[PDB]
């Protein structure tokens, strides 16, 4: 039974609002989420994190913020058309949506603005630098089995004892969690553990795009081969992800129903907007582009792109994209809106193992067209490719810079935590001080909650120590990471 | 004259507008289409690089023009929602025509909130300064205030007051003031229409006219619209466009659009407060240091009062007993919330209270002017900021550099304003002229969109006219003011350095 009053939860993790509440009171609860997200520095920090073009110095190219805001308007159009199209059938009052029309919209808009919020300084190359740097240190490939036997892992406590323990299972989880950083998983850690934004459970579920646990070592399941594409949460949040699996009526590895609207609005706006930037960064011409599209496929091309191409020609360039946007928007937003209503049962359970755009439909054929033109003629450009190469070194150098903090022993590091300045560790003292306090309080809070006596305690302290470091790096700008790297290499 | 919002919340455009009936769902769609143009406009992306109080702030954690205009967007929402909700309960809504125009009411504010500042020049009020100063040295409007005569300090020729009329010295008199009175807002109106051409819905385009004074106004203002005409809100280049806009919305001369008063409020409130949040981030002072500046800035506080409900309230809430970024990040969203819960409705009421003078558009006040213990709160920041935030020496210095950057940039392109009409016109037609190598290449730099507006507007002239030379020059300096003003802090900075051969 599709009852959206049972999913759109307006309760919080802390200081929750309780009991009853008007249709207007439940609104103001979600209007408080808007003010919490818009005024957040983590959303401001996006005008300096990069989307497609690293460090692009002309504002006319989209950043993560201007992109996320355009996703926000596409999700509004999709949500408003699902409410209108589902109102053509009046199934709203049958689905519990008769009094949750605003929260339906608002959660999408807000969780559209908050994807990507946890992405590291250099896009898929921050992710790369981090996982690669941690694999070389704590090889998760070796802990896969049992034993045993020549364990190539530089951490002592995390090497598998030959030596069997069920505490060797903790070892296995940690080694794979830390080597599988993901913007989506780090986004959940960001809003809860690090920012403590409070927020409604619904809004916090609207940013959970993936359901695979980072520590997942086994490359399974079929039923959920798509929703478990990338990790969506870390070992450090297994508990929080459980409290939400309850609060939103989600099954294990099941997604929130409104996440599918954002994912559609995300894919829809980056495909076209990246080609708009490419022409602005003068990688090619409006004409040059058109032929790339034609050589890439009466059909849909004529309905959408050909349509805008002839309309553009007697700014022919302004002109070109204003329509291409509209034509794509007029044909793909309704396809998504209906495809949502069509598969609503599996989407409400959050088990639907496909994306809102069907590789079958000619409508999805249009999206893969836009993405393949960009992959061949934009993401392959050499100025993009080296800024990609530079960022991988910046982040990998930052990690090696701070490696001496991961080298200390539990006693020596804990000493450094309490004694802010330790005499015999001047270098580690000053390195520790560079770590943002927010990131430091999260390590303290989580380690305080541990059993001091436990034989697993040393293993958890190191996990949260490595997670504290990953929190620092990832919570950085493209630009702040580059400056810090140069400052600390004594070249600036 | 009855408060009827069917006569204001229009659904028409100036170009390729739809006509006929239109369902309530059709009217929402028509304003949601505007939304897609404003958000997807490059003119708004250009804000993540424009200055907000802090020039070229190198950490995203400080606000730009986009992030500030974004937070203002949310303050106008929280006010329309409290203005209309209070109106549906009493009486009414349907008696004002808002029963079917509820979504458009919100969307108009929300969108025209993102679009203030859209016309602001690269270096804030110092772009405004650098531009008016550089043009005053050329076209002294001080001399053409009266008649004659007698030694016109005007550096142009076809613009000196002659003489010996010519009752066309009034056109001269008008232009000599318009170009010396560029304004972030008046340039915003030119921007959405003449230059960017989004064709926005007359209602939406009325929500951005924060002022009603024409730039060419050479008078000492009136007494009724003695507020709404503090600064210019439009240029002579749009005198006609504002006529048709004043009609479609049934506005009398110098009367504001009813939703603009909401916008000033969303603006007034988001900056003053957010600026102090940044100052603390920039370590100018501490959240503690800040406080002292507030109660030492307050007056007649005595005992229980407003300061206590809002800032005192947040002061004790901050010093432990909750945190999650440790007292400061805490102090700020309480101070934000407290200021918001106790001010958004107050403003909301002021709207409903004077809604006739506010809807007929004549109310010579803003929804936060009166000596109410609530305006007293705004001035507190506002005055705390002007003394200990905007006066910092690193802020004052980058303001000085920006004045030089924009001022040199105008002097670099000064050669195009010196050519004669026939000389300039030739360079326009044949994009490349042989005896003007320097002037040709300077011309190619002037981004097209700005150029098309010069051709478009001049083509529409009477070439035979004795006015034609003077209109050619107005539209020429506007083409230059358009190029400069439509620049980022950083692009204007790089251009000055690229063209001074220092980088
Ligand atoms: N320069 C460059 N840009 C890329 C590359 N791949 C993607 N982009 C741009 C285009 C899009 O804005 C975005 C594409 O990747 P996303 O990870 O944002 O898409 P997707 O939704 O599949 O990932 P997600 O599920 O969010 O983790 O970045 C690349 O390899 N190089
Ligand atoms: N750095 C610096 N910032 C200033 C100064 N005066 C104002 N600001 C900043 C602080 C506020 O963000 C904002 C105040 O002016 P606005 O341009 O936003 O003014 P106003 O509310 O009069 O509306 P308007 O812009 O006239 O439409 O600009 C100054 O002297 N220095
Ligand atoms: Mn995205
Ligand atoms: Mn403002």
Swiss-Prot record, chain A:
Cofactor(s) needed for function: Mg(2+)
Enzyme class: hydrolase
Keywords for this protein: Hydrolase, Magnesium
InterPro entries recorded: dGTP_triP_hydro_central_sf (IPR023293), dGTPase (IPR006261), dGTPase-like (IPR050135), dNTPase_1 (IPR020779), HD/PDEase_dom (IPR003607), HD_domain (IPR006674)
EC number from the UniProt entry: 3.1.5.1
SMART domains membership: HDc
Record-level Gene Ontology MF annotations: cobalt ion binding; dGTPase activity; GTPase activity; identical protein binding; magnesium ion binding; manganese ion binding; single-stranded DNA binding
Catalyzed reaction equations: dGTP + H2O = 2'-deoxyguanosine + triphosphate + H(+)
UniProt domain HD: residue ranges: 64-271
Pfam families for this protein: HD
Record keyword Magnesium present: yes
One GO process term, biological-process aspect: nucleobase-containing small molecule interconversion
SUPFAM superfamilies on file: HD-domain/PDEase-like (SSF109604)
Gene3D superfamilies: Hypothetical protein af1432 (1.10.3210.10), putative deoxyguanosinetriphosphate triphosphohydrolase like domain (1.10.3410.10)
Family recorded in the similarity comment: Belongs to the dGTPase family. Type 1 subfamily.
Function: dGTPase preferentially hydrolyzes dGTP over the other canonical NTPs.
HAMAP family: dGTPase_type1
Assembly and interaction partners: Homotetramer.
Name of the protein: Deoxyguanosinetriphosphate triphosphohydrolase
The organism of origin for this protein: Escherichia coli (strain K12)
Protein encoded by which gene: dgt
């Amino acid at each position: 039974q599709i009852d959206f009053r049972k999913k759109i939860n307006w309760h919080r993790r802390y200081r929750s609002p309780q009991g009853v509440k008007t249709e207007h009171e439940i609104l103001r609860i979600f209007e408080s989420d808007r003010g919490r997200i818009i005024n957040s520095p983590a959303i401001r920090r996006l005008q300096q994190k990069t989307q497609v073009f690293p460090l692009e110095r002309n504002a006319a190219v989209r950043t993560r913020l201007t992109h996320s805001m355009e996703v926000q308007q596409v999700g509004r159009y999709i949500a408003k058309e699902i409410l209108s199209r589902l109102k053509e059938l009046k199934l709203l009052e049958a689905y519990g949506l008769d009094e949750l029309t605003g929260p339906f919209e608002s959660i999408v808009e807000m969780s559209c603005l908050m994807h990507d919020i946890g992405n590291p300084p250099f896009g898929h190359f921050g992710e790369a630098a981090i996982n690669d740097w941690f694999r070389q240190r704590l090889h998760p490939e070796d802990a896969e089995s049992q034993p045993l036997t020549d364990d190539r892992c530089s951490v002592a406590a995390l090497r598998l004892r030959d030596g069997e323990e069920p505490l060797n299972e903790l070892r296995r989880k940690i080694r794979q969690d830390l080597c599988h950083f993901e913007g989506n998983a780090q986004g959940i850690r960001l809003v809860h553990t690090l920012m403590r934004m409070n927020l409604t459970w619904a809004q916090v579920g609207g940013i959970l795009k993936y359901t695979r646990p980072a520590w997942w070592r086994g490359e399974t399941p079929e039923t959920h081969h798509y929703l478990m594409k990338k990790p969506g949460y870390y070992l450090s949040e297994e508990a929080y992800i459980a409290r939400l699996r309850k609060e939103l009526n989600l099954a294990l590895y099941s997604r929130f129903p409104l996440t599918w609207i954002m994912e559609a609005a995300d894919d829809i706006s980056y495909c076209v907007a990246d080609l708009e930037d490419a022409v602005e960064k003068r990688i090619f011409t409006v004409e040059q582009l058109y032929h790339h599209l034609h050589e890439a496929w009466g059909s849909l091309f004529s309905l959408v792109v050909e349509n805008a191409w002839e309309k553009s020609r007697s700014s022919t360039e302004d002109q070109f994209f204003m329509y291409l946007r509209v034509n794509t928007l007029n044909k793909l937003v309704p396809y998504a809106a209906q495809r949502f209503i069509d598969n609503l049962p599996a989407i409400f359970a959050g088990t639907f193992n496909h994306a809102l755009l069907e590789d079958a439909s000619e409508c999805s054929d249009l999206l893969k067209l836009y993405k393949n033109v960009a992959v061949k003629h934009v993401f392959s450009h050499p100025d993009v490719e080296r800024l990609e190469l530079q960022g991988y070194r910046v982040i990998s150098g930052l990690l090696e810079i701070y490696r001496p903090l991961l080298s200390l022993s539990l006693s020596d590091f804990t000493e450094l935590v309490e004694k802010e300045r330790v005499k015999r560790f001047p270098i580690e003292s000053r390195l520790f001080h560079k770590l943002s306090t927010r990131h430091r309080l999260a390590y303290v809070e989580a380690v305080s909650k541990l059993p001091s006596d436990s034989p697993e305690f040393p293993l958890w302290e190191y996990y949260y120590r490595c997670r504290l470091l990953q929190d620092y790096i990832s919570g950085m700008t493209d630009l702040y990471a580059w400056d810090e790297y140069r400052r600390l290499m004594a070249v600036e």
